[PDB]
Structure formats: C-alpha cells, structure tokens
C-alpha cells in the first residue's frame, strides 16, 4: 500500500488507483474501528 | 522578371482526382492527379525559361 | 477477487496451522539466538 | 474512552463522506493519457506528395521549444489532409501544452498556401474514442443524407462543439454549400474558362 | 460530459420538423451507470453476508449490529478522502473499493 | 516460483463493452461504389443472422481509421442490452469470432471487426509498434524497399513467431499531367491560368462565402462528374489564350501513369513508415521487440529504429513490480518491530506471506485467467490482511512472552 | 460597413469557430451599424482568467483569414472584461487651448 | 424627474449597482431566439407580440 | 421556432433560494451535533437548538 504512489508513467497511477484508498480504508478503518467500535461494544451487548 | 518566372516554374499545385467525390454510378478506378511539382536541384533551376 | 479468495484458502488453511504461523515465535525467534 | 462522541465522528465521515458522493454523476475512468495535442490542415484537391511538402513539412519545421513533448507524428493524405499529433508526458497540462502548439503554428501560418488557410487549420485535444454517436434519422418525408447532415450542422453541431468539455465533434456528413457544377462544352461554346 | 451532450440535444428537440428521431447507435454511458449498480451489489450482499456468518460463531442481533455499523462509516469516509489535498475521485477506485471492502 | 514464470501477466483485460465496431478496407484506389458493396455485405450480417444480439448498425462509408478516404469505411454496432444475451456465445467475446470468420472467409477485400480495448489506446498486453525512419535522406522508394526487406525477414520467423503488417500500404498509380511550360507560353496562355483550370475543375475551389437562410456557408465550384471520371476527359477541357480563343489540353500537356503514395507518414520531422506487429504464441515483447531491433540494423544505411505504441514509455509490470516490492519490502520488514522489537518478528511474518501467494497462481491458472492489475492488488491484500492472521498471532501470542 | 454586413462577414465567422473552449457558459454578439462587433464568452465563476483567455484567442486564430483584409489590420483583440471603470482621468487645457 | 419631465428624447440617470454587474434583486433579462431559421423581420414581430 | 433563454440574472444557480434552505440543513446537522460533545444524548439538542 502507499509506496506504489511512486509508479510508472502510462499504467498511470493504476497502483495508486490504489495503494492508498485501501489505506484511505485501512487508516480510516484503523481510526474508525479505533475511535468507534470500543464505543459500540460496551453499550448494547451481552 | 527573374522573380516572377521563378515562382511560375518552381511551383507545387493541387489538382483534382480521376473519379472524384461525387462520382458516376459505375466508376471503377480512383486515382489522384499530379500536375506540377517542386524543383529539387541546381540543374532544374538552371533550365527555368524566361 | 479470484486472487483474493484463492490467496485466502492458501493462507486460511495453509497458514492457520501449516508451515510458518506457529514456527514463528518458536522456530524464527530463537532456535539460534 | 466513552460513548456519545465517536458516533458523532461516525455522523461526520458519513455526512462529510456523503457530501463527496454528491459528485454524482462522476466519470468512469482514471485518465491514463500521455496527452495528445493535434494540428489539422487541409489543402483541398492537392495530392499526398504536395501536402507533405507544402504544409506538413512547414508545420514540423516550426516545432521547436514546446515544453515537455515526447514525439511527433504526421499523416499527409491523398485526400489533401494532414494531422500532426504532439504527445506530451502523462499529466503535463492539457491547457498549457495546447497553447504552445498553437503559437508555434502562429509563425508557420503564412508560409502555408492561401488555399490551405481559410480552409480551417485548428489545434485541439485528442482521445481517439467516442462517448456518443447520435444518429439523426428520418421517419416521414425522407430528408436524405445531404439534407439531414446539413440540418444537423445548421441546428445541432454548433451547440455541441461549443459546450461541456468537447475535444472535437466529428459530424457524419457535411453542411450545405452553393455548388457550381461546370460543363466544359457549354463552357467552350462561349470561349469561357473555369477561371 | 456526456450528461451535457444530451443537454443541448434535449433543448433542440421541439424545433425539429418532419421525422427527426434521434437514436443512440453507440454510447458509453450505459456501462458507467452499471459499473456502479454492480458494485453496490457487491457491497449490499456483502453487508448481508456480514451480519450472517456472525449468527454462526457469536450469535444474536444485539451483537451482530456492532461489526455492521462500522461498514458504512469506512466506505462513506473513503470516497470523502478521494478529493482531499490534490488527488483522486473516480471509479475503478469504486470498483477497487469492493476489493478493500 | 514455477507457477509464476509459467503464468503470464495481464495488463487491463480486453473487456466487452456492450458495443463494438468493424474495419473495412479496399485495394488499389477503389471507388465509393465498391466499398459500399462491402459495407452492405457487413450491415447485412448483423441484421440477418444476429437479430438477437445486434441492436443497431451505424455503417459509415468513407470513414475508416488511420485516415479517411474512398477506400476505407467502418461500421459501429450497438448490442441488444446485457440480459437479452445470456451465454458467452451471445456476447462480444465470440460475436466478433464468427463475424471475423464470416467476413474474412470469403471476400474480395479485407474485413476485421476488432473489440474496443477498454480505454482510449496504447499498450494492449504483448503488442508492439515498430517505426522505420529515413535518416540519411534517401528516397521514399528507397525507404519503402527497406520496409519490405524488414517485413521479409520478420515474417521469415514463424520460429520464434511474429505477425507483422504495415499501415495504409498501397502506393497506388496516380495520373500525372505534365504541363509543357514553353509550349504553353508560346500559344498565349498564362501558367497561373491553366493550373487554376486544372485545379478548380478537378479538385474544387473555395471561392467565397454566402448566407443560407440564416447563417454563412461555403461556395464551392468543381464541375460535373461527367467530365472528370477518366484521363480522356482532361483533353476536352478548353483554356483561353491572349488571341481570344480556346486552346485545349494535350496540345500543351502530357499524360502519364505513375506510381505514388496515397499516405506518406513522418516521425519527428523525418520521413518514416510505420510497421505494426506481434509478440509470438510463446515469447512476449522482451524478445519480440529485441529481435526486431536488429532486423533493421542488418539492412541499408540511414534507416534507424524507434517505438511509440507500446514501448510505454517506461511502465508495464517490468520496472513496476520488482522496485515496487523493494520499497514495499523495506517498509514491510520495518515496523514488524515497532512495538514488536528486534529481528525476532521480521521473519515470523515477512515470509508468512508466500502462503497467500500460493493460489493465487492456482486460482489464476486452474481457473484459466492471468495475473493482472487486480491480482497485482489482490496478491497485495493477501499480504496485509494475512498479517492480521500472522502478526496478530505473533503479537497475540508473544504478548504472553 | 453596415450592421447586416458585419454580422455576415465577421460576427458569424467568429461564432462559427467557437468549439472546444474549456468550460464556457454562453456567447453573445453585437453587430453594430458603426461597423463594430464584440463577442463576450462568459465562463464559470473562478475558472482561469488567464487560460480562458488564450483558448478564445486560439479559436479566432483559425477564423482570422476568413475575415476580409479590410477588417484585419484594423485591430481584432481578445481581453478580459469588467464593464466598470476604476478611474477616468480628464486631460483638460487651461492656457493656449489645444482642442478636442 | 427634471430630465424625463419635458424632453424630445429619453434620458435616465441610473445609480452604480455597487459592483461590476449581474443580479440586481428582483430583476430579469429575457432573450428571444431565431430557432427554425426565420427572417429577422419575422423574429422582430414575435418580439413585439411578446 | 422561437424558444427562450436567460443570462442576467437567472444567476446561474445562486441567490437566496437554494442557498438558504440547504445552507441551514448542513448547518442544522452540525448545530444539532456536538450539542452532545461533552453534553451527551438528545438532552441538550433541544435545550439550545431551538
């Protein structure tokens, strides 16, 4: 992920068509399943 | 008279075509027509008549 | 997604117990140093 | 860590997230073009050898100092037409690589025969592919090929070519012209010439 | 583009005379209308497949709601940080969104 | 690693569009009459024996790709929905297959029917686009021979195969009117008067503009087709002299048939003919281009070589797959020690990755297919998501240590 | 030239060449009897006053020789508009009156 | 008032709208177009009819 | 063959309308929120939002 952002030239940014976004997913997943999820756990559960 | 006769002989002209755009129904061959062409050497320029 | 689901069963059955995973904190951490 | 926040962070990233989906429609691709800028000249009636020497070579001669650039190809045709496609580096500037090519031609313009000028010359951006072909067909008092293609140009084409980001509109046919079909015998009879 | 090649074409329909039915012999639009409708599919029945397979293993509506409330937020957030800074905002990023799903 | 080199790569795959197009081309200076005969023979196929697949045929005569002319022509095809054609036999995949078969089976002129490459252009998968250039300043005829000589040795290799053909080849006979400058000047006619006659009467002239029911349109003077169909019509054209009477052609002109090119092409200000080719059923690009490099180097002086297609420039899988995982590796190997520490973890996971990459090449091979740029993303998620299976048992365990 | 001529001879010829200008909202014309015409291409709020300038000029650069050589050499220019003035600076005489 | 009160020709005296132009408050600017390709005289009549 | 079009005026797309209801719609969604940041629940979102 990310580093493929130093790609080629005519396969434009097809590896930046996402080495990010699966990072815009992962880091956001890391953060959305960090800020939220623990808060979603101990509310309605058990 | 040198100038006027230069462009008169050293000329590239665009002529039409045999069997052109609006044709006669049954035309078989289509070919481009070449009339005059640009002189390419010192000898051909020497032969420019005045 | 064929490379994912396939790349899954080869790393969800062959990883869970098979070869590496388990030879990881044991075989690869020490065994030498 | 506790509750009533986080869900609000989930209220954002979804509202602010859904504000960026308001990009509807949004494109299919990812533009992967080393950009193409094309120059098109047309000497009417002239052969392929003439249009190479009289326009094609004259334009190519003036292609010095265009920023970036990868290569330069030409197609001097027997139909009396030629296109010169200057290809630039992937993601240069389709708007700045446009004006330079036009302003190199702007010093090769009067070196071209005044038969070829007034007969067009244009510089635009290329794709080689179409988004839409829109056929105007007749289903009543049949207008006919020549009649339709004129109307589609004298009522529709002008509004297209000058609208939402159209590179170039290659219409299917041609608009009307006052055609004078000479006769050499009814022309010889009165000691006249096409001149 | 494309949504506006039709735009002019829409306003010049009434001034047309006898027999001018505009047809569509070749159009690209159809598939980009589908390359969204077919990946909403591999997203909705992904979500359906998500709160299933949870009734197996952990069991219960009151506990399967938690790992499924997270999925809109991450997806909605991903096509928000496409525009961000000076980059993307595309499909294939929406097609490849499914591989990140 | 064996399941890897044997499995070929894939660019972006040739995907069906719900719309495709054909390719019609005719021989040495054919008429608009002869090409329409072929286009009708094409428009027929899609409307007769493919009613359940073909929605519309938009046949355009005189168009054709690589340039317009009275020798080309192409037809656009709309296809009947997507659900209206169930099987593989029902869509572009093989619709073009019998189309390519039925057209090329029996015909006086060549016809194709390609599929839209799922983008604008450039780089198919294993394709190439060679170009031969006039370097020393030889003749076009002297160049075309080296083009033929290269096409002669390239096709001479069905062993380590290739498939090479040029563009708008031809070189059709063009009629040349040879105006005798001194014979004309003798009998009272002006040179800027014969050329205007020969030009306007055969090619047409943009005189001025005129207003037609609301807008400005053109005024073209050309002359009836009745007197411009054949070389003999050149004679019955009359030009006025200074005396005040009509001197016809042939009395001052010469009529000769001569070979010339209908499509001259130039690469970078130098006269250059293009050649389009293939890779081979076995080898691809890396060798298909390499043998082609010195087929031109082993022929006449002042010839050179260049590529544009194709030949990227600088991209593909090569150079964008080893250095990709080099800078991926330096990152991968690192922070496998962020809160894990030492070289203890960098082997407990960094080479757990070849579990996922196993099939993968099983799925890519035993399901037909080929390694593409979603394999080159899936092969890349079966690395990171496998970590939450690997680095989340080395961490999930070793936290017990 | 009259208003009818300047519509047919210059105005319509320029408007004919207005295809492929990025953005654009509309196009208005004013073929006057004084023998003058202005064509104002209006673009989207905050396009680029410097890039929407050069395209309009380079669409005219293919309609230039289709205009009579009476109208050429007699100007033709492309610039940015406001319709309002910042300053009017009157130079008046208060001695040996020069005159208008 | 004083200008328009008595005069052979029309005279106004507007106020500068505090900007360059466009959108007063409740204003409008209609435009009637020759669509089918009628005459200018045939157009001006529809302008008068409106 | 007459049609209609506007330029003045007719914006294009602005004014108070379309830029006063959707303005306070996205203002409201924000207003209503973080009236629970350190205040919590739907207890405060009516003690102030109205």
G55 in contact with D, Cβ within 8 Å: yes
Q: Cβ of F209 and G66 within 8 Å?
A: yes
Give G1-81's CATH code, choosing from 3.40.50.1700, 3.30.70.20, 3.30.70.1430, 3.20.20.105.
3.30.70.1430
E96 chain-F contacts, CB cut-off 8 A: 374, 377
Helix, strand or coil for residue B7? helix
Task: State how far Cα F270 lies from the chain centre.
Answer: 21
Pairwise CB contact (< 8 Å): H23 & I14: yes
3-state secondary structure of F347: coil
Whether the CB-CB separation of F55 and F156 falls below 8 Å is answered with: no
Q: Taking each helix axis from N to C terminus, what angle separates D96-105 and G51-60, rounded to the nearest 10 degrees?
A: 30
Task: Give the integer Cα–Cα distance in Å for F26 and E101.
Answer: 52
Q: F92 with F17: CB under 8 angstroms?
A: yes
HSE-CB for F33 with a 13 A CA cutoff: 12
Q: Please give the CATH architecture assigned to the domain spanning F172-260.
A: 2-Layer Sandwich (3.30)
Residue pointed to by tokens 């014309």: G29
E19: left (phi over 0), alpha (psi -120 to 50) or beta: left
Residues 6+ apart with CB under 8 A from F61: F32, F35, F36, F39, F73
φ and ψ of E45, to 5 deg? -75, 0
Contact assessment for residue B12 and residue D43, using Cβ atoms and an 8 Å cutoff: no
Question: What one-character DSSP code corresponds to residue F297?
Answer: T
Closest to F352 (Cα-Cα) out of F399, F400, F317, F392: F392
Retrieve residue F135's tokens: 């370097």
Task: Compute the half-sphere exposure of residue F276: CA atoms within 13 Å on the CB side of its CA.
Answer: 11
Cα dihedral I26, I29, I32, I38 in deg (nearest 10)? -110
3-class DSSP state of F165: strand
What is the token pair recorded at H3?
């200008």
Run of H or E including F176: strand F173-179
Cα D171 to Cα D149: distance, rounded to the nearest angstrom = 8
Q: What angle do CA F379, F385, F386 make, to 5 degrees?
A: 80
Is F46 buried (19+), middle (13-18) or exposed (0-12) by CB count in 10 A? Answer: buried
Complete DSSP assignment for D126-170: --S--SEEEEEE-SSS---HHHHHHHTIIIIIHHHHTSSS-S---
The yes-or-no reply on A/E contact (3 CB pairs or more, < 8 Å) is: yes
Breaks (C-N over 2.5 A) in chain D follow: none
CATH for D32-126, among 3.30.70.1430, 3.40.50.1820, 3.40.50.720, 3.30.413.10? 3.30.70.1430
The upper half-sphere exposure of residue H47, i.e. CA atoms within 13 Å in the direction of its Cβ, equals: 12
Residue F129, token pair as written in the block: 């686009």
Burial class (CB in 10 A: 0-12, 13-18, 19+), D68: middle
Q: Does H have 3 or more CB contacts under 8 Å with I?
A: yes
Method used to solve the structure: X-ray
Minimal CA separation from E25 to chain F, in Å: 5
Q: How far apart are CA B13 and CA F66, in angstroms?
A: 25
**Angle D57-D62-D68 (CA atoms, 0-180°, nearest 5)?**
115
Distance (Å) of CA D104 to CA D37, F385, G60: 13, 54, 15
CB-based contact A15 F376, cutoff 8 Å: yes
Q: How many C-beta neighbours within 10 Å does residue G75 have? A: 7
Handedness of CA D104, D109, D111, D116 (dihedral sign): positive
Q: Provide the 3-class DSSP secondary structure of residue F218.
A: strand
Q: CB distance from I4 to chain E under 8 Å?
A: no
The string over F240-254, giving b where at least 16 C-beta atoms fall within 10 Å of a residue's C-beta and e elsewhere, is: beeeeebbebeebbe
Alpha-carbon distance I28 to nearest alpha carbon in chain H (angstroms): 27
Beta strand B31-34 pairing with F173-179: parallel
According to DSSP, the residues that pair with F307 across neighbouring strands are: F130
Cα F86 to chain centroid distance, Å, stands at: 31
A24, A27, A32, A37 alpha-carbon torsion, rounded to 10°: 140
* E30, E35, E38, E39: CA torsion to nearest 10: -160
CB neighbour list of residue D38: distance below 8 Å, 6 or more residues apart: D83, D84, D85, D86, D123, D124, D125, D126
Interface touch G58/D169, C-beta < 8 Å: no
Give E11's contacts in chain I (Cβ within 8 Å): 3
Closest by alpha carbon to B13, among F253, D193, G69, D182?
F253
Q: Name the token pair of B9.
A: 């002989």
- In angstroms, the CA F26 to CA F61 distance is 11
Residue with tokens 């109205």: I50
- DSSP SS3 for E11: helix
F148-152 long-range Cβ contacts below 8 angstroms, 24+ apart: F149/F299, F149/F300, F150/F275, F150/F295, F150/F296, F150/F299, F151/F275
Here the tokens at position D31 are: 């533009």
Question: Which of B31, B38, B41, B47 has the highest number of chain F CBs within 10 A, making it the mutation to test binding with F?
Answer: B31
CB contact under 8 A, A24 and E73: no
CB of H35 within 8 Å of a chain E CB? The answer is yes
Distances (CA, A) of F316 to B13, D45, F67, F124, G21: 47, 44, 29, 11, 34
Resolution in A: 3.6
The DSSP element (H or E) to which D86 belongs, if any, is strand D81-87
Q: E29 in helix, strand or coil?
A: helix
D40 near F CB under 8 A: no
Which residues of chain G make contact with F211, given a CB cutoff of 8 A? 8
Q: Do F265 and D176 lie within an 8 Å CB cutoff?
A: no
* Topology (CATH) of F122-171+269-317: Alpha-Beta Plaits (3.30.70)
Cβ contact A13–D30 (<8 Å): yes
What whole-number distance in Å separates Cα of residue E78 and Cα of residue D14? 9
Residue position matching structure tokens 């309009």: G56
Tokens, residue E44: 């909705």
CB-nearest to C2 from F351, F367, F389 is F367
Counting other chains too, the contacts that D119-123 makes at CB distance below 8 Å and 24 or more residues apart are D119/D42, D119/D43, D119/D44, D119/F206, D120/D40, D120/D41, D120/D42, D120/G62, D121/D39, D121/D40, D121/D41, D121/D42, D121/G62, D122/D39, D122/D40, D122/D168, D122/G62, D123/D37, D123/D38, D123/D39, D123/D98, D123/G58
Contact between residue G31 and residue G38 where contact means Cβ atoms under 8 Å apart: no
Q: Which chains touch H (3 or more CB pairs under 8 A)?
A: E, F, G, I
Assigned superfamily of F17-121: Multidrug efflux transporter AcrB pore domain (3.30.70.1430)
Cβ G52 vs Cβ G23: under 8 Å: yes
Q: Are residues F104 and F56 in contact, defined by beta-carbon separation less than 8 angstroms?
A: no
Contact status, residue F352 vs residue C15, Cβ threshold 8 Å? yes
Touch between I and D (at least 3 CB pairs under 8 Å): yes
Q: How many residues does chain B have?
A: 50
Q: Which residue of G has its CA nearest to H21?
A: G83
Identify the DSSP state of F90.
G
Q: Is the dihedral of CA G43, I12, D30, F54 positive or negative?
A: negative
* Gyration radius of chain G over CA positions: 17
Chains H and B touch (3+ CB pairs under 8 A): no
Are G65 and D117 within 8 A, CB to CB? yes
Q: Which of D103, D109, D161 sits opposite G19 (nearest CB)?
A: D161
Q: Helix, strand or coil for residue F262?
A: coil
Q: Name residue, tokens 């079966």.
A: F382
Chains contacting G (3+ CB pairs below 8 angstroms): D, F, H, I
Instruction: Show residues of chain B in contact with F180, CB under 8 Å.
Output: none
Other C-beta atoms lying within 10 Å of the C-beta of residue F66: 15
Q: Reduced to 3 states, what is the DSSP secondary structure of residue F55?
A: strand
**φ, ψ dihedrals at G98, nearest 5°:** -70, -50
């Amino acid at each position: 992920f990310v580093p493929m952002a130093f790609f080629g030239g005519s396969t434009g940014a097809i590896y930046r068509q996402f080495s990010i976004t699966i990072v815009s997913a992962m880091a956001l997943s890391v953060l959305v399943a960090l800020i939220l999820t623990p808060a979603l756990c101990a509310t309605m559960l058990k | 008279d040198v100038i006027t006769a230069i462009k008169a002989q050293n000329a590239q002209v665009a002529a039409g075509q045999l069997g052109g755009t609006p044709p006669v129904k049954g035309q078989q061959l289509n070919a481009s027509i070449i009339a005059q062409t640009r002189l390419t050497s010192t000898e051909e320029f020497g032969k420019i008549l005045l | 997604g064929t490379g994912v689901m396939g790349g899954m069963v080869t790393a969800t059955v062959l990883a869970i117990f098979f070869v590496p995973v388990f030879f990881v904190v044991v075989r690869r951490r020490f065994s030498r140093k | 860590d506790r509750p009533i926040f986080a869900w609000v962070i989930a209220i954002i990233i979804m509202l602010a997230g859904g504000l960026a989906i308001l990009k509807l429609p949004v494109a299919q691709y990812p533009t992967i073009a080393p950009p193409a800028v094309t120059i098109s000249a047309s000497y009417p009636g002239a052969d392929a050898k003439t249009v190479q020497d009289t326009v094609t070579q004259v334009i190519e001669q003036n292609m010095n100092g265009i920023d970036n650039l990868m290569y330069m190809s030409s197609n001097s045709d027997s139909t009396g037409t030629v296109q010169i496609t200057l290809t630039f580096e992937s993601g240069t500037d389709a708007d700045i690589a446009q004006v330079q090519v036009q302003n190199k031609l702007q010093l090769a313009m009067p070196l071209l025969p005044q038969e070829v000028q007034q007969q067009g010359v244009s510089v635009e951006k290329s794709s080689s592919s179409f988004l839409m072909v829109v056929g105007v067909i007749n289903t009543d008092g049949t207008m006919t090929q020549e009649d339709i293609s004129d109307y589609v140009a004298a009522n529709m084409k002008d509004a297209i070519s000058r609208t939402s980001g159209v590179g170039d509109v290659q219409l299917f046919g041609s608009q009307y012209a006052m055609r004078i079909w000479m006769n050499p015998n009814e022309l010889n009879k009165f000691q006249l010439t096409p001149v | 583009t494309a949504a506006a090649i039709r735009a002019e074409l829409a306003k010049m329909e009434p001034f047309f005379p006898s027999g001018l039915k505009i047809v569509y012999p070749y159009d690209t639009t159809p598939f980009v209308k589908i390359s969204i409708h077919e990946v909403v599919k591999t997203l909705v029945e992904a979500i359906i497949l998500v709160f299933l397979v949870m009734y197996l293993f952990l069991q219960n509506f009151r506990a399967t709601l938690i790992p499924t409330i997270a999925v809109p937020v991450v997806l909605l957030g991903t096509f928000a940080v496409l525009a961000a800074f000076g980059f993307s905002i595309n499909t294939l990023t929406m097609f490849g969104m499914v591989l990140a799903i | 690693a064996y399941l890897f080199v044997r499995l070929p790569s894939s660019f972006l795959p040739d995907e069906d569009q719900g719309v495709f197009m054909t390719m019609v081309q005719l021989p040495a200076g054919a008429t608009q009459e002869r090409t329409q005969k072929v286009l009708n023979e094409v428009t027929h196929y899609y409307l007769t024996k493919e009613k359940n697949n073909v929605e519309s045929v938009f046949a355009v005569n005189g168009f054709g790709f690589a340039g317009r002319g009275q020798n080309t022509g192409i037809a656009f095809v709309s296809l009947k929905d997507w659900a209206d054609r169930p099987g593989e036999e029902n869509k572009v995949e093989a619709i073009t297959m019998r189309a390519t078969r039925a057209f090329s089976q029996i015909k006086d002129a060549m016809v194709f029917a390609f599929n839209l490459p799922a983008i604008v252009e450039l780089g198919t998968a294993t394709g190439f686009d060679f170009e031969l250039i006039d370097q020393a300043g030889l003749g076009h005829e002297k160049l075309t021979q080296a083009r033929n000589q290269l096409l002669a040795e390239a096709a001479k290799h069905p062993d380590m195969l290739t498939s090479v053909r040029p563009n708008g080849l031809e070189d059709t006979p063009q009629f040349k009117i040879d105006i005798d400058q001194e014979k004309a000047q003798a009998l009272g006619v002006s040179i800027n008067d014969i050329n205007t006659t020969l030009g306007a009467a055969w090619g047409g002239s943009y005189v001025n503009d005129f207003i037609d029911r609301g807008r400005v349109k053109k005024v073209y003077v050309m002359s009836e087709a009745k007197y411009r169909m054949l070389p003999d019509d050149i004679g019955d054209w009359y030009v006025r002299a200074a005396d005040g009477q009509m001197v016809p052609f042939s009395a001052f002109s010469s009529s000769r048939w001569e070979y010339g090119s209908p499509r001259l092409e130039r690469y970078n200000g130098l006269p250059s003919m293009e050649i389009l080719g293939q890779a081979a059923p076995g080898k691809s690009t890396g060798e298909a281009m390499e043998l082609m490099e010195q087929l031109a180097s082993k022929l006449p002086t002042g010839v050179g070589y260049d590529w544009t297609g194709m030949s990227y420039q600088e991209r593909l899988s090569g150079n964008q797959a080893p250095s990709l995982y080099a800078i991926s590796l330096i990152v991968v190997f690192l922070c496998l020690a962020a809160l894990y520490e030492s070289w203890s973890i960098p082997f407990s996971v960094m080479l757990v990755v070849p579990l996922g990459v196993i099939g993968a090449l099983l799925a890519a091979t035993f399901r037909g297919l080929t390694n593409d740029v979603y394999f080159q993303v899936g092969l890349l998620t079966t690395i990171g998501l496998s970590a939450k299976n690997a680095i989340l048992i080395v961490e999930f365990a070793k936290d017990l240590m």
